Amino acid sequence: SEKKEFLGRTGGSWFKILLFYVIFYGCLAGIFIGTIQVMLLTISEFKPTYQDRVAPPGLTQIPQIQKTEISFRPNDPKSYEAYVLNIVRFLEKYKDSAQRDDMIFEDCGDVPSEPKERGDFNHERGERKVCRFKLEWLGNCSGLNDETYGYKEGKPCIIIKLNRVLGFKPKPPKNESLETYPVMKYNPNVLPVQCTGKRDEDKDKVGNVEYFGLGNSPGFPLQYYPYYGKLLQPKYLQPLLAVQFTNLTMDTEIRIECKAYGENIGYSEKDRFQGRFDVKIEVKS
Amino acid sequence: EHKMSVEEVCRKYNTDCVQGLTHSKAQEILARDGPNALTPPPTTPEWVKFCRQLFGGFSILLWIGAILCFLAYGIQAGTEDDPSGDNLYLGIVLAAVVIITGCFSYYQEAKSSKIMESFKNMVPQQALVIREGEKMQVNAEEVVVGDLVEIKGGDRVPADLRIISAHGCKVDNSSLTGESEPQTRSPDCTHDNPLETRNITFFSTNCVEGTARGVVVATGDRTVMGRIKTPIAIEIEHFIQLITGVAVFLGVSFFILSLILGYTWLEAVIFLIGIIVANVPEGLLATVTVCLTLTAKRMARKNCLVKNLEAVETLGSTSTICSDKTGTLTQNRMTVAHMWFDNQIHEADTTEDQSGTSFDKSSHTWVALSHIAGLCNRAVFKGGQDNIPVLKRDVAGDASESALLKCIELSSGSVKLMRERNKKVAEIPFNSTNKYQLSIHETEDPNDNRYLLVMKGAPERILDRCSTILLQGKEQPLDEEMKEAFQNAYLELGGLGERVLGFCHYYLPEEQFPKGFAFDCDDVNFTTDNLCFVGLMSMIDPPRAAVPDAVGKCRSAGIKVIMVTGDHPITAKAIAKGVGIISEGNETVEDIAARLNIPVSQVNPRDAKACVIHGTDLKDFTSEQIDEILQNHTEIVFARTSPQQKLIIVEGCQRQGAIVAVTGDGVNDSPALKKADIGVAMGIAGSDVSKQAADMILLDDNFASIVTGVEEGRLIFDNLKKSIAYTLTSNIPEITPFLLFIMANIPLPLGTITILCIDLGTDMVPAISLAYEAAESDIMKRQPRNPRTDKLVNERLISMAYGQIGMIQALGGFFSYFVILAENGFLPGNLVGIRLNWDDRTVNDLEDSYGQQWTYEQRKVVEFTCHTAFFVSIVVVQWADLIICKTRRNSVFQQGMKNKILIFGLFEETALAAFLSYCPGMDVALRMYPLKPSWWFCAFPYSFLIFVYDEIRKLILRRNPGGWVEKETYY
Amino acid sequence: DPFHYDYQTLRIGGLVFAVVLFSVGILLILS
Ligand SMILES: Nc1ncnc2c1ncn2[C@@H]1O[C@H](COP(=O)(O)OP(=O)(O)O)[C@@H](O)[C@H]1O
Ligand code: ALF
């Protein structure tokens, strides 16, 4: 067995190997930290060196749903609390009081316009100005009157949001003659977005779809892009698009895919959430 | 065939029971019966070594992993559509690795077994069959039934024998009755059963003592026999058991942790397989096989038989070598040079024309001495040798009697006719324990038909037995001055380093010994006392050419050399001085007494290093005294030792924990070979029993082969140690990434697929490649390893592999992972605690240090790029790990890059690393993504760091031997 | 820039590099 109290615990003066290991690990940590700092010197702070892995950003939705489905019953206010709570928690930062004037935000165009250039990525200027986005443009979707965002009488009203990419200026599709499917009131400065059923039985029977965008055109106005960074543009309000299904069936899972067409928007079969997203929606009774 | 008389047994076969068999009948009967080869197994284990090697070893685990991956892909296919395989590729690559390893191991094993088969047929057995009344060295595979066969003490009996004449013959069966006790033989039947009667000797039963002559009864498979670990291996087995236990513990713990984290059942089981396969050194068995084949090739390069290839490691770890005097250290081809009779030293007139007339050839004393020398010898010439010079004539029998017979033939006349003139009536064969050989002969002259008892052997025993000495034909008692003069002559002869015998005889009286007397070989009714002394016969014993250089090299390797022999202390001391056992300037107790003219008892036994301890004194010594002798003295030379005393000396040397190797040729060294850790027997001059019992046979009979054997053994140990040190480094940089993933909640830095790829690309080919590495310059200058302390795997080696090099490799991989993540957009500051959101399949808004938001698959692509970068970085640091593992104590600059297979393995692992990432379509197969060229240099600083660190450590090792660095960081 | 640069050519260049290393490794032992 392990002998003790006659010569020492498998050794004499134990504070020799331990000291050597302490110095060795200390110097190893020191050179590791030095290498990390040397590497951090090379990487720019205002922009990343590599962005090909943030290939055209994917659309997402405020009602972040864990099992890619939306299910509830209007008869139970609780059944949709998990959705409206998450919606309002994210939308609270868009309240008019939060977005104030005086060199933190700025008043910004009520009509879609060209992407505003805010200088170079260099720090020659201070923190850049930010366009302001109002819940009034969300129309009936925003809880200006009832803090329900639907889910009470009508079927859910999801909201579409495009992921931020540093210094990325989307361009609306050119050659609007065909654009595969036709669009109503084609115009630049808007990134068109369309929600439609995936399967043939889903392409119809979904009912009418009302886009509560900005400037009576379903899409993302370009006046907000490009995003310039968390350090350069703190408290940045990306454009939002609200979609409400006024009339449609009940007690049936309807699969809807919300695409966004553009020349700088790509598509991947591996990533189902890049440039589009699928939703399964059904209301119980 | 036991009850019948010799006449019946020799007339049943139509053979001459007195003379033998001529070549006429021998060829035809050989045709009828064929060669007497005991039946081997039907053909061999065929095609089953291949399957056993690809099924057994440390592979069964890999086979389990492969089949588990295959069924994981099956269950993934048998459920909801999951087109991403990620498992069939793993199964195919695992099976391919297993098959390639098995095929390579089988090819190497066949390469070694071919050499082993070439060796076992290289040295055949032989027997002194009698044909046309003559004995020739005929192969034992030729001897037919019916021919007369003679069996000598210390040889293997060729086939079943019907004894017709025995002289103290004793047979060691050890294989038919289970009684290892030698059994006395006799021509007369004693028991009805043939398994116990003392007149039949069985097949494959060596005759330890005495000589006998008989007629074969059964040869071949129709014969009585025809019907009825090593420390390196145990160390390897213990290490394998311990490493497998550690691996299973780590794999189980990781599997439970994965289940708590809830990857999936399939991901968790695949992670278990990856960890368990990665944590075991599966390349050990192939490396050991490669080392064994290289050892076999190197041994065949200089004709050295090895029974078990793993005994070379024991030979490498030896610390004491016990050597015989004649037949091993000397060429065992002696010739008579000096005599001594009538109180005078006579030089041998070894000339046909007697040029010189040094000594009279007609004196009565010389006549008696010549009669004694020619009559007591058992040596016999060869057939058709009458046309050859006496010196060049071939002689059968031991070297001493051969040289004596040659000298008698050259000087006196015809030995054979002289023997046939004086009828021989009794024989007591020579014995190592007796050290004297006797025979009784009749006298040709009828004037006084008095029986002549002729003795020869060790001079001290002869003097003890004899009482008178022949002086110029007279007969006078042994006076004190006569004894002192004989002594002085003996020391003078020994000072020349020549073997000296003692000759004496005695005329038996007629009134008490009649003509028709009956002697016995077991009941000593002779008057073996108060005999008459005649004279001595010195013989030139030349040491082999390679012996001094071999001894010098072996002693320089920290191996003590002890020369244990049965000869006299003066001759043993002279031979040891000539061959270098006692280096010039080293001085014994008797030499101190002689130089200072002081009694030996007054001499302190501390100023003397060498010792020439007698043999009869060893009977009075105890174990503590023997240990004191072995400790206090550095160059010990035992002398006048019986085989039992040789075994006692070997066991005493063993009692210090020191590995001892014994080399010998005669039957007297058989017990020492049977007891020593490794026994060496000489090929041409060795006896059959010694070479049967030894673990190593020197076919070409050179003593320098032992030095190269120790060289190869130490090389085998060092190559295995280097391979273990290299393959054990990669364990940490694979368990560590998961540990930091689970501790700091950072994204996973190393996946299971990358772990398996790292194992099969870095711990597979370079591991075997390190076995091909040559020997350094300190292999023959370092002290022999301590088996109890310097194990194959120890605490220092584990520390070096895990806490010093594994840590550096893990840090390099982590630096690569962090630089990848920071370049893509995730700074190291905001990575801790992000695993909960990073792994979530529904959070596609994950922010980073710059504000841009990633989808799930977009960030998973970056994580898999980090995995590939980690794999490449581990390959890059494994470059330097392999380079530093090439040499143990010397610098890689001094050692040199002379190993082709090592650069081969480096280039192949780098090519695998490049192809596994940049091959198109590999992003979905093994989830490996291309990495930018600037990312190939992340681990370069760490590779330079580890190379510099080990070079500095080895420099400290070389410049400060025995320091704390050697104590705690030298594996 | 979003547009990929260092691929469809990193694949070709890396395959060329790996083939060169493979040839050099497999040719050294023979010579
Ligand atoms: N063939 C022999 N016939 C008679 N006496 C012998 C013979 N061989 C050796 N002797 C004596 O026996 C002594 C010891 O011989 P032994 O112990 O059998 O082996 P070794 O001589 O090789 O040490 C020697 O000193 C030698 O003088
Ligand atoms: F000197 Al030996 F067997 F040859 F004891």
Author numbering:
A (entry chain B): 19 to 303
B (entry chain A): 33 to 260, 271 to 1013
C (entry chain G): 28 to 58
Provide excerpts from the study.
P2-type ATPase sodium-potassium pumps (Na+/K+-ATPases) are ion-transporting enzymes that use ATP to transport Na+ and K+ on opposite sides of the lipid bilayer against their electrochemical gradients to maintain ion concentration gradients across the membranes in all animal cells. By utilizing energy from the hydrolysis of a single ATP, the Na+/K+-ATPase pumps three Na+ ions out and two K+ ions into the cell in each transport cycle. In this work, we focused on structural and functional characterization of the human α3 Na+/K+-ATPase that comprises α3, β1 and FXYD6. Here, we determined the cryo-EM structures of the human Na+/K+-ATPase in five intermediate states during its transport cycle, including the cytoplasmic side-open (E1), AMPPCP-bound cytoplasmic side-open (E1•ATP), ADP-AlF4− trapped Na+-occluded (E1•P-ADP), BeF3− trapped exoplasmic side-open (E2P) and MgF42− trapped K+-occluded (E2•Pi) states.
We trapped the human α3 Na+/K+-ATPase in its Na+-occluded state using a buffer containing Na+ and ADP in conjunction of AlF4−, and its K+-occluded state using K+ and MgF42− (see Methods for more details). As anticipated, in the presence of Na+ and ADP in conjunction of AlF4−, the human α3 Na+/K+-ATPase is trapped in the Na+-occluded state (E1•P-ADP). Despite the strong densities of all the helices in the TMDs, except Q920, other highly conserved cation-binding residues, including E324 (M4), N773 and E776 (M5), D801 and D805 (M6) are poorly resolved in the occluded-state cryo-EM maps due to radiation damage. Nevertheless, we can model the binding cavity and bound cations reliably using the coordinates from the previously determined occluded structures of the pig Na+/K+-ATPase. While F90 residues acts at the first gating latch that regulates Na+ access into the transmembrane region between M1 and M3 helices, L93 situates right next to the Na+ binding sites, serving as a second gating latch and supporting the M3 helix in the Na+-occluded state. Superposition of the cytoplasmic domains in the E1•ATP and E1•P-ADP states by the P domain showed that a helix formed by residues 708-717 of the P domain rotates about ~14o closer to the N domain in the E1•P-ADP compared to that in E1•ATP state.
